[PDB]
C-alpha cells in the first residue's frame, strides 16, 4: 500500500515484522485469529504506554498490521551487560509498565503475555505494552479461559495450577517476575516444565498455606508440594530497599485477590519515594 519495506525485523509463528515508512508492519479458517484479536483490541485502546495500531490492510486472507516502530525491549536491556539498571531506571520501567497495565485493566482487558521482550521501548524511552495476540477481556462470568497463557518463566501460580477464571493478578505476577528480572539481570524462576516452575516458585518464596491462599486446594491442577520456607526477600534482592521489597511482596502474593493491582501498586510509597523515576529521554539504550 502506502508503505515500502525498509528492513526485516523478525519472524514468528504468527507473522513477520518489517520496518517501513517510521512504522513496523506485521504481515480454511480465514483471517488469522491472532491478527483479528490485535486489531479488535488495539482499536479500542489509546494510551501512551500501550502499542498503537496505526493502520491495517491486506489482500485475500492476508492482513498487514501497522504499528509505531519500537526501538528495543526490556529483554535486550536486561541481557545487555554494558547497561547498568539503577533504581531510577527500574522505577521508570515499572512505572510505565504499571500505568499501561492500569489503563488496560480499567478497560477490562488482560494482557496475559507480559514478559521483557513484550515491553517495547521507542527512541524516546516510552515503554509500551505490545504483542496483544493473547490479550483477552475479563470480568464476564460466561467466558472461560485457558491456563496455558503467559510464558512459563512469568506464569503466575494460579495459572500453573490450572485457573480457568482469573483477573489482573496473572498480569501483576508477571510484572513481579519482570521486576525480579530487572533486579537480578536473570530470569527469577526459570523452570523447565510446569512442575519445575512451581518448584522454583515455592523454593524461592515458600510453599503457600491455606491461609496465604484460602482456596488454592480448589484449583483443578493443584499439587501439594514440599514445605519450602522460602528465601527471605531481602536475601534474594540484597540491594532492594524496604519500599521496593513491599512492592515485590505485593506483586508476589500467592493469593491472586490479595496480590496488588496496578492501581494499588502505583499508589505505593516506592513510586512516590525518592529517587524519582528517570525521564524517558534518560533511560538506557542497548
Amino acid at each position: 500500500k502506502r508503505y515500502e519495506k525498509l528492513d526485516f525485523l523478525g519472524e514468528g509463528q504468527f507473522a513477520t515484522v518489517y520496518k517501513a515508512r517510521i512504522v513496523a508492519i506485521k504481515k480454511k479458517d480465514g483471517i488469522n485469529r491472532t491478527a483479528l484479536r490485535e486489531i479488535k483490541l488495539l482499536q479500542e485502546l489509546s494510551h501512551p504506554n500501550i502499542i498503537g495500531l496505526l493502520d491495517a490492510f491486506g489482500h485475500k486472507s492476508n492482513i498487514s498490521l501497522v504499528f509505531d516502530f519500537m526501538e528495543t525491549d526490556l529483554e535486550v536491556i536486561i541481557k545487555d551487560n554494558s547497561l547498568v539498571l539503577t533504581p531510577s531506571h527500574i522505577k521508570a520501567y515499572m512505572l510505565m509498565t504499571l500505568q499501561g497495565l492500569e489503563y488496560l485493566h480499567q478497560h477490562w482487558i488482560l494482557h496475559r503475555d507480559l514478559k521483557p521482550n513484550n515491553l517495547l521501548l521507542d527512541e524516546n524511552g516510552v515503554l509500551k505494552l505490545a504483542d496483544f495476540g493473547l490479550a483477552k477481556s475479563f470480568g464476564s462470568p460466561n467466558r472461560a479461559y485457558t491456563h496455558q497463557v503467559v510464558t512459563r518463566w512469568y506464569r503466575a501460580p494460579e495459572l500453573l495450577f490450572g485457573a480457568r477464571m482469573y483477573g489482573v493478578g496473572v498480569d501483576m505476577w508477571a510484572v513481579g517476575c519482570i521486576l525480579a528480572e530487572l533486579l537480578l539481570r536473570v530470569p527469577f524462576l526459570p523452570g523447565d516444565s510446569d512442575l519445575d516452575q512451581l518448584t522454583r516458585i515455592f523454593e524461592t518464596l515458600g510453599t503457600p498455606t491455606e491461609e496465604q491462599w484460602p482456596d488454592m486446594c480448589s484449583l483443578p491442577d493443584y499439587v501439594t508440594f514440599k514445605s519450602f520456607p522460602g528465601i527471605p526477600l531481602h536475601h534474594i534482592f540484597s540491594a532492594a530497599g524496604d519500599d521496593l521489597l513491599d512492592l515485590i511482596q505485593g506483586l508476589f502474593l500467592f493469593n491472586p485477590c490479595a496480590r496488588i493491582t496496578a492501581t494499588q501498586a502505583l499508589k505505593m510509597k516506592y513510586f512516590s519515594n525518592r529517587p524519582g523515576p528517570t525521564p524517558g529521554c534518560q533511560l538506557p539504550r542497548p
Partner: peptide
C-alpha cells in the same frame, strides 16, 4: 468476503 467486510467496517470490530 471476510477481508471486504473488515475493510468496510474500517477495522472497528468491537
Amino acid at each position: 468476503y471476510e477481508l471486504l467486510l473488515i475493510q468496510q467496517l474500517n477495522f472497528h470490530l468491537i
